[PDB]
Design a binder for this molecule. Structure first.
Ligand SMILES: O=Cc1ccc(O)cc1
Ligand SMILES: [Fe+2]
Length: 525
């Protein structure tokens, strides 16, 4: 059986997200009082903000959109607000310069990921960010982020776009991975390609709790590398260089911004916090591989930098292949690479010209999207909440982003791992943590994540109490599916302006439309 209407032609290209899911969603709006199962913890007081790629227009501009990447599509924010056991939902597109152009034209006008040479001539000198990667609340300002531009600011309640570059950063770019220091309250980050397309320049910054840049430095990367993520320690910002190189000539020729390079080692840039000179910066190297995301970093008793990350032993983004024919064949040969969770040791006192020691295998399982207890951000931490391929319960032939069917709670101090299984015909997305109370022990509280109910065509928010990591306490049940996203964040009420007075949904007026006389009911009848 084939449905007769199903053979009617579509104009849409295949627009994947990171999961490999290819269904456009693109809805903007609200559900008041989202259906829940079980008991929503009363301790939840805040918003789960999630961001997703969801091409608003069919991306047909360049090569009919055949080379669209899962990381490409227009940023849409989903908000799940938890107040007094009740859940509200809002979804809205980031009103990026790109989004607004495409909507107004009813037409795709942008080409390849980070390639202005493949955009429509009229839009080449625009901010080309889809603001689709990560969110942050800092100094009462809510930001949607993507590494190829400054953030766009959004209202935390309506999700209305308010402007571009709220902190007025001098770089062309800002990381989608800044870290909120638990010591200073500073927004610590960077922007690479800080001076334009294929530039080696890196700008480091620290934005204080009052929204002022208090520390900065202009530096360079050893090559124009893909510096997606970083680690924050007491004394350092540690940049993590993926083995991809940008090439302006290739871009001009209508090739991809990035090419994977087997000859490049995993490289780290150590930046002393509040460094007075670029002379203080050191480059460290290991071997070829792709460490996608950090859990976090710290300094041990010996003063050594300790960073946990995912590690893929090859290209986790095969849609950005190598330049050379030889290297292309290597990618094909690698297939689905080995994927682990690993521990790095960078001793800042050692010779940085000497190759770093091999990382320690922490989990011999495909691992992605780690988060921590952010009360321990930029200090010694123990808890990691990791998006996992569940041992003996998962594929493993899948690309690292495409088989994530569980959660792991790792504790360094205890040396224990606990496992949550998403369900049969289910995927689960990045976990976020909310502490039981302000003074609760590290990693004691609630874990939230988006579950794709694949055979149901619905998305859910699972709620797990850390006292029993194997079991859900609650589910937030959407009537539909949303896109499989990238990052999300737990944002507490206390850091959100006007959380006490504003919901996700604007309340209707109190006053009745109808006069008293219009009632069917008479109290005398
Ligand atoms: O998760 C990886 C990622 C990399 C670059 C992007 O622009 C977005 C996401
Ligand atoms: Fe990321």
């Amino acid at each position: 059986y084939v449905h007769p209407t199903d053979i009617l032609p579509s104009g849409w290209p295949t627009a994947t997200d990171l999961s490999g899911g290819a269904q456009p969603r693109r809805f903007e709006g609200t559900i008041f009082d989202v259906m829940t199962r079980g008991t929503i913890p009363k301790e939840l007081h805040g918003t789960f903000y999630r961001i997703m790629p969801d091409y608003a227009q069919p991306p047909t501009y360049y090569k009919g959109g055949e080379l669209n990447a899962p990381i490409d599509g227009d940023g849409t924010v989903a908000a799940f607000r938890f107040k007094d056991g009740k859940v509200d939902y809002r979804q809205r597109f980031v009103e990026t310069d790109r989004f607004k152009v495409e909507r107004r034209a009813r037409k795709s006008m942008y080409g390849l990921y980070r390639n202005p040479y493949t955009h429509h001539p009229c839009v080449r000198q625009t901010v080309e960010s889809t603001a689709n990667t990560n969110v942050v609340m800092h100094a009462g300002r809510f930001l949607a982020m993507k590494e190829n531009g400054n953030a766009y600011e959004m209202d935390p309640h309506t999700l209305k776009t308010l402007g571009y570059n709220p902190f007025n950063l001098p770089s062309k770019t800002m990381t989608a991975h800044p870290k909120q220091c638990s010591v200073t309250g500073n927004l610590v980050g960077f922007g690479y390609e800080a001076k334009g397309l294929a530039t080696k320049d890196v700008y480091y910054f620290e934005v204080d709790p009052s929204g002022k840049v208090v520390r900065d430095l202009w530096l360079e990367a050893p090559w124009c590398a893909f510096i997606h993520d970083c680690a924050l320690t007491p004394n350092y910002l540690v940049l993590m260089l993926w083995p991809f190189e940008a090439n302006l000539e290739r871009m001009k020729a209508g090739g991809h911004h990035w090419a994977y390079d087997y000859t490049k080692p995993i490289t780290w840039i150590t930046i002393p916090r509040g460094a007075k000179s670029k002379d203080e910066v050191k480059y460290w190297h290991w071997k070829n591989g792709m460490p996608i995301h950090t859990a976090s970093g710290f300094e041990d008793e010996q003063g050594r930098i300790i960073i946990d990350s995912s590690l893929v032993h090859g290209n986790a983004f095969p849609f950005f292949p190598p330049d050379s024919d030889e290297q292309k064949k290597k990618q094909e040969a690698d297939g689905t690479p080995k994927a682990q969770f690993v521990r790095w040791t960078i001793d800042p006192r050692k010779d940085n010209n000497e190759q770093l020691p091999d990382p320690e295998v922490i989990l011999d399982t495909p691992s992605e999207f780690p988060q921590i207890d952010n009360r321990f951000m930029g200090v010694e931490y123990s808890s990691a909440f990791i998006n996992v391929f569940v041992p003996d319960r998962s594929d493993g032939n899948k690309n690292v982003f495409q088989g994530l069917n569980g959660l792991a709670h790792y504790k360094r101090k205890e040396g224990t791992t606990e496992w949550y299984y998403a369900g049969d015909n289910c995927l689960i997305q990045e976990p976020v943590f909310s502490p039981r109370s302000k003074d609760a022990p590290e990693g004691d509280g609630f874990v939230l994540a988006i579950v794709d109910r694949l055979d149901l065509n619905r998305s859910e928010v699972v709620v797990i109490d850390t006292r029993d990591f194997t079991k859900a306490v609650a589910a937030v049940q959407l009537p539909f599916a949303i896109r499989s996203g990238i990052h999300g964040q737990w944002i507490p009420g206390e850091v959100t302006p006007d959380f006490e007075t504003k919901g996700l949904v604007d309340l209707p007026k109190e006053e009745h439309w109808a006069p008293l006389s219009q009632s069917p009911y008479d109290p005398d009848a």
